[PDB]
Each structure stands twice: as structure tokens, then as C-alpha cells.
Amino acid sequence: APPIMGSSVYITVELAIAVLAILGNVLVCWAVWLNSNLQNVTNYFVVSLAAADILVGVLAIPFAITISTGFCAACHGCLFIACFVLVLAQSSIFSLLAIAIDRYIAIAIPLRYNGLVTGTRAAGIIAICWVLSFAIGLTPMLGWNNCGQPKEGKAHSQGCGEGQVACLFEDVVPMNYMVYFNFFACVLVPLLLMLGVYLRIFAAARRQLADLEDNWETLNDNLKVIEKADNAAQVKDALTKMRAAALDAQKAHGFDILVGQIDDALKLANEGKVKEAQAAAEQLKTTRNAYIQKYLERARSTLQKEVHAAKSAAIIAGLFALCWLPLHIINCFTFFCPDCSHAPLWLMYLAIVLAHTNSVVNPFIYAYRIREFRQTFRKIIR
Ligand SMILES: CC(C)CCC[C@@H](C)[C@H]1CC[C@H]2[C@@H]3CC=C4C[C@@H](O)CC[C@]4(C)[C@H]3CC[C@]12C
Ligand SMILES: CC(C)CCC[C@@H](C)[C@H]1CC[C@H]2[C@@H]3CC=C4C[C@@H](O)CC[C@]4(C)[C@H]3CC[C@]12C
Ligand SMILES: Nc1nc(NCCc2ccc(O)cc2)nc2nc(-c3ccco3)nn12
Ligand SMILES: CCCCCCCC/C=C\CCCCCCCC(=O)O
Ligand SMILES: CCCCCCCC/C=C\CCCCCCCC(=O)O
Ligand code: NA
The missing domain is CATH 1.20.120.10 (Cytochrome c/b562)
Structure with a gap:
């Protein structure tokens, strides 16, 4: 029974993911800094994504551990800890979307690519993407939250002080936000656009x-x-x-x-x-x-190299979808089937771990798929 035992497992797995996410993605950033052949617009988006993944390890995972205790907290402080990971997931979606479009310009308008897609503009795009990501992921702090109807028995049982809630994700983040706004509009729609951009990329490479x-x-x-x-x-x-x-x-x-x-x-x-x-x-x-x-x-050989890079980018985007969809689909059951019993906690926690694992995986894709990353990785380690 002791909740501390099941908690010990969940925590040491989260900390292990965090170490890996930080180390692997620090190496991506170091590699791009050192190797001027990796400094291109596509890879500024890889770095921005690596920066989100580092922040999963340094902040989102410590936040998730904190919030799994249900500790007493002022409700808006609770919302920040609960929602910050939504910022990072959104930022990732935007970086992944930008990469798709980059690879599409490169293959469908190689004429004007270098002319249209510059490094100073890319930085401006990344900045805007992070700002929007904050605005989307922290929207519950603007009033779309359950702070006005706190669970008073849970707060009393826990000994919380006046004007505090037991800080639990589903108690304070409304499920209509998570399903309609976050999942359908901010996640699912971009992912489908991405799917459409990749279909166009592979079709164009084929026609050429x-x-x-x-x-x-x-x-x-x-x-x-x-x-x-x-x-x-x-x-x-x-x-x-x-x-x-x-x-x-x-x-x-x-x-x-x-x-x-x-x-x-x-x-x-x-x-x-x-x-x-x-x-x-x-x-x-x-x-x-x-x-x-x-x-x-x-020409055949250059074309195939671009298809190869596009495949690598698509794998990264497919693995994002794979790691995150289970949590969103659970939230849909919770929201749309009140007659259903709630997904059990062990599964909730497996889905959260799965989403966090995404932050470890990209460095391995780069290393196995992009020769220049792999060579730079091996040099750094010596
Ligand atoms: C680059 C970094 C080190 C800059 C400084 C960050 C400082 C200001 C941060 C890091 C850890 C933070 C603390 C983490 C936890 C708590 C407990 C909470 O109940 C009150 C705030 C408090 C006490 C935070 C205050 C601000 C804090 C001390
Ligand atoms: C972002 C970098 C620079 C610093 C680290 C993040 C800091 C600012 C975060 C980490 C944990 C956070 C705290 C988590 C818990 C609480 C208790 C609640 O009753 C009020 C908000 C408060 C006090 C939060 C304030 C912001 C906080 C201290
Ligand atoms: N539903 C949900 N719960 C949690 N954490 C709390 C898990 C839980 C759920 C029920 C319960 O009684 C006790 C704990 N984190 C969560 N993160 C997400 C999320 C992030 C992106 C999409 O969904 N969903 N989500
Ligand atoms: C180089 C350092 C990298 C690791 C930094 C990790 C810092 C984690 C920061 C905050 C963790 C959240 C802790 C919040 C505890 C709140 C406790 C309380 O409300 O009384
Ligand atoms: C990335 C910057 C890291 C700077 C070091 C931050 C170190 C603080 C880390 C965790 C603090 C959480 C402690 C919570 C104690 C509250 C419990 C209690 O006393 O009731
Ligand atoms: Na990510």
C-alpha cells in the first residue's frame, strides 16, 4: 500500500529520463556551436527543440514530480507548475512545424530558398514561437482554470492553509481546455498540417x-x-x-x-x-x-540526399506524436466519457513518463541518421 513505494519508482524513472534528456540535448547544442557545417537554418530549429528538451529535464520533470504529491499551494502558483510543460510541448510543435516547412522550401523552391530563408529571420521566427508557446500553454493562468471552484475537502484533508488548494493537475486545469484548446486546436491540427507538408515533400521529390x-x-x-x-x-x-x-x-x-x-x-x-x-x-x-x-x-544524388533529410525530420515528428498522443487520448476518455471509470493512476503515470521520454530520443536519431552530427558527436566525446 505505502504510496511512498510506488512513488519511489515513478520518481527515480523521471530523474533518469531527466539526466538523459539534459545530457543528450546538451550534446546537440554543443555540436551545432562547434561545427560550422551544422550552422544552418534547419539546425537553429533543431537547437530550439533541443532547448525545449533540456527544459523538460531541468524544469518540467521536477515540476511533474512536485505536482504528483498534491502539495498545498496557492492555486495560480499550482497552475504555473501544472502548465509549464504545455509551453515546452507547444514550442516543440512549432519547431517541428518550421522544420517541415524548411525542408519543403528547400525541395520545392531550391531557386529562392537561400534567398528566402535566412538565419536572422529564423531567429526572429523562433522568438515569436516561444512567445506564442508561453501564451498558449499558460492560458489557464488568464482565468480559464478551476481556481474559482476549489475542492475544499481535499484542501482540508491535506491540512492546506487558507486560500490554498491541493495542487493536482486535473483539479485545477479544466479538461475542456486540455481537449478542445490544447489537443484539437494546438496539437492535433499542427500535426496534421505537418503530415500534409511531408506528403507534399515526398510527392515533389518523386515528380522531380x-x-x-x-x-x-x-x-x-x-x-x-x-x-x-x-x-x-x-x-x-x-x-x-x-x-x-x-x-x-x-x-x-x-x-x-x-x-x-x-x-x-x-x-x-x-x-x-x-x-x-x-x-x-x-x-x-x-x-x-x-x-x-x-x-x-x-541531380539524382542531391535529390536523394534531400529526401533522406526529410525522412529524418519526419521520424522526429512521428516520434513526438507517438510519445504524446496517449496522454491526450486519455484526457479525451476522461472528458468525453463521464460514465467511464477514470484511467488508473499507474497508467496516467506511464503516459506522463512516455511523453517525457520523447525528450531523450532525438539525439539518437541525429546520431544514427545525420553523418555530420554523428561525426561531431564522436569528436566531442574524446
Ligand atoms: C540562475 C538561478 C540560480 C537564478 C536564481 C534562481 C532563484 C531565485 C530560485 C531558484 C530556486 C527557487 C526557489 C524554489 C522553491 C521555492 C519554494 C516556494 O515555496 C517559495 C519560492 C522558493 C523558495 C523559490 C524561490 C526562488 C528560487 C530560490
Ligand atoms: C525560471 C528560473 C529562472 C527560476 C526557477 C523557477 C521558479 C521561479 C519557480 C519554480 C517553482 C515555483 C514555485 C512553486 C510553488 C509555489 C508556491 C505557491 O504557493 C506560490 C508560487 C510558488 C512560490 C512558485 C513560484 C515560481 C517558482 C519558484
Ligand atoms: N490528465 C493529466 N493528469 C496529469 N497529472 C495528474 C494525473 C492524475 C490523474 C488523476 C488523479 O486522480 C490523480 C493524478 N498530468 C497531465 N498532463 C497532461 C497533459 C499534458 C499534455 C497533454 O496532457 N494530462 N494530464
Ligand atoms: C544545474 C541545475 C539543474 C537542476 C535545477 C532544478 C531546479 C528545480 C526547480 C524547482 C523545482 C520545483 C520545486 C517547488 C517546490 C515547492 C515546495 C513548496 O511549495 O513548499
Ligand atoms: C536551475 C537553478 C537551480 C538552483 C538551485 C535550486 C535548489 C532548490 C531545489 C529544490 C527546492 C525544493 C524544496 C522544497 C522544500 C519545501 C518542503 C517543506 O519544507 O515543507
Ligand atoms: Na520536445
Whole structure:
């Protein structure tokens, strides 16, 4: 029975999570500071997220331990301790959203990316995100709370003084706030937007790669049309497709060799010289094996690197959802099913631990998925 025993377990697990969350995320921040190849806008959002995770370990976890005792407290002081973690969760959602959008600009408008997405603007965005996060997570302190209807028997039983409550999460934070405002509007909607941004990212990477492959089969389909053609009207036709395809590819060092050759051969076809156009078009086979093939596979290789980075970002966002959704779903049962008995305490505490674990996991993702983080991690440790 002794509540101190079950409490001892919950506390030592929370403290273990805290140590890990602080250590791992301190290493992320140190790595970005030391390695100028990690100083890019994407990674300022990683740092902001790492800073939220550090604060989970230093403040949210000590707060959660404190609030699990039900200690007597002025109700608004209780709300701050109860709600501060909602600030950190929101800040995380905003950083994750920013990363998604960053990776989308990078892949869908590489033209204007560096031009549109700068480091001083990113800092301004992060500041605004933290301010909003405070405003959302501390909204119960503006009056959307249960401080005006305190549980007087619980306060008396605990020996609390005048104008104090027993400080327990569900006693002071209204469940309509947690479900409608925090979960549906501030968590769920952003996560679905994120899901939409990632669907768009992977679709765009796919269309771009089909195109590269498409333009490439066209240059080749047409080069066999030319080589087996009989009428001259055909050479013109097939070589005309190579040109257009040659420019899309250029857009999508020595393409001007390729286009110059098509142009040479084109003029021959129009002047009725089929055998010499066919032979001139044959030069196109060399410049392809020396240049055009080169654009192709490096473009393929850069594209795949961006998809890889986007996958890494999506995993981090998926793991956030996974760690936090159970608590939100429990709150939905509590709120929407009064006829149901309340989820038991051991499960409440498992869901809280699970959410806190999220703050440990990201450094491992970085280390296993991003070579530059991993290399920087290994150097720091020596
Ligand atoms: C960078 C840091 C060290 C700056 C200084 C932080 C100080 C002001 C903080 C850290 C710990 C805090 C204390 C933590 C707990 C309590 C108990 C509460 O019933 C009254 C406030 C009181 C006594 C706090 C007062 C402010 C405090 C002393
Ligand atoms: C944020 C950094 C710089 C400092 C550490 C946070 C400090 C300010 C936090 C940590 C714990 C908090 C306290 C927790 C409990 C109580 C008792 C309640 O009856 C009034 C509010 C009061 C006194 C809180 C005031 C703010 C507090 C002291
Ligand atoms: N419902 C809930 N409870 C708690 N803590 C108190 C757990 C509890 C619940 C009932 C009870 O009688 C005694 C203790 N922390 C909580 N944090 C959250 C939360 C954060 C983000 C989403 O939900 N929900 N939440
Ligand atoms: C480098 C230090 C990192 C760890 C810092 C942890 C500091 C935790 C700060 C506050 C914990 C909350 C304690 C509140 C106790 C209230 C007790 C009371 O109301 O009488
Ligand atoms: C991050 C800054 C850390 C600075 C050190 C802060 C140290 C204070 C930590 C915990 C204090 C909580 C003690 C609560 C005692 C109240 C119980 C009581 O006496 O009735
Ligand atoms: Na987080």
C-alpha cells in the first residue's frame, strides 16, 4: 500500500529520463556551436527543440514530480507548475512545424530558398514561437482554470492553509481546455498540417525524379529514331524533341555542347542532308557519356540526399506524436466519457513518463541518421 513505494519508482524513472534528456540535448547544442557545417537554418530549429528538451529535464520533470504529491499551494502558483510543460510541448510543435516547412522550401523552391530563408529571420521566427508557446500553454493562468471552484475537502484533508488548494493537475486545469484548446486546436491540427507538408515533400521529390528520368529516356528514344530514320522530316522531328528535353533538364557546365550539336544537326536536316545529320547526331552519343549523364546522376544524388533529410525530420515528428498522443487520448476518455471509470493512476503515470521520454530520443536519431552530427558527436566525446 505505502504510496511512498510506488512513488519511489515513478520518481527515480523521471530523474533518469531527466539526466538523459539534459545530457543528450546538451550534446546537440554543443555540436551545432562547434561545427560550422551544422550552422544552418534547419539546425537553429533543431537547437530550439533541443532547448525545449533540456527544459523538460531541468524544469518540467521536477515540476511533474512536485505536482504528483498534491502539495498545498496557492492555486495560480499550482497552475504555473501544472502548465509549464504545455509551453515546452507547444514550442516543440512549432519547431517541428518550421522544420517541415524548411525542408519543403528547400525541395520545392531550391531557386529562392537561400534567398528566402535566412538565419536572422529564423531567429526572429523562433522568438515569436516561444512567445506564442508561453501564451498558449499558460492560458489557464488568464482565468480559464478551476481556481474559482476549489475542492475544499481535499484542501482540508491535506491540512492546506487558507486560500490554498491541493495542487493536482486535473483539479485545477479544466479538461475542456486540455481537449478542445490544447489537443484539437494546438496539437492535433499542427500535426496534421505537418503530415500534409511531408506528403507534399515526398510527392515533389518523386515528380522531380520521374522528370529527370523522363527527360533522359526522351533524349535516348529520340537518338534511335534519328539513327534508323528514312525520311528527313523525321530527323527534324526527333531531334526537335531532344532540344526541348535538353533545356528542361538543364533547368530541372557543358549542356551548350549538347545543344550546339543538336543545333548543328538540326540545320543539316532542314537542308536535306539526312546521312550527315544522322552521323552528326551520333556525336550526341559522346557528349552524353561525358556531360549529360553527369548532370543526371548528381541531380539524382542531391535529390536523394534531400529526401533522406526529410525522412529524418519526419521520424522526429512521428516520434513526438507517438510519445504524446496517449496522454491526450486519455484526457479525451476522461472528458468525453463521464460514465467511464477514470484511467488508473499507474497508467496516467506511464503516459506522463512516455511523453517525457520523447525528450531523450532525438539525439539518437541525429546520431544514427545525420553523418555530420554523428561525426561531431564522436569528436566531442574524446
Ligand atoms: C540562475 C538561478 C540560480 C537564478 C536564481 C534562481 C532563484 C531565485 C530560485 C531558484 C530556486 C527557487 C526557489 C524554489 C522553491 C521555492 C519554494 C516556494 O515555496 C517559495 C519560492 C522558493 C523558495 C523559490 C524561490 C526562488 C528560487 C530560490
Ligand atoms: C525560471 C528560473 C529562472 C527560476 C526557477 C523557477 C521558479 C521561479 C519557480 C519554480 C517553482 C515555483 C514555485 C512553486 C510553488 C509555489 C508556491 C505557491 O504557493 C506560490 C508560487 C510558488 C512560490 C512558485 C513560484 C515560481 C517558482 C519558484
Ligand atoms: N490528465 C493529466 N493528469 C496529469 N497529472 C495528474 C494525473 C492524475 C490523474 C488523476 C488523479 O486522480 C490523480 C493524478 N498530468 C497531465 N498532463 C497532461 C497533459 C499534458 C499534455 C497533454 O496532457 N494530462 N494530464
Ligand atoms: C544545474 C541545475 C539543474 C537542476 C535545477 C532544478 C531546479 C528545480 C526547480 C524547482 C523545482 C520545483 C520545486 C517547488 C517546490 C515547492 C515546495 C513548496 O511549495 O513548499
Ligand atoms: C536551475 C537553478 C537551480 C538552483 C538551485 C535550486 C535548489 C532548490 C531545489 C529544490 C527546492 C525544493 C524544496 C522544497 C522544500 C519545501 C518542503 C517543506 O519544507 O515543507
Ligand atoms: Na520536445
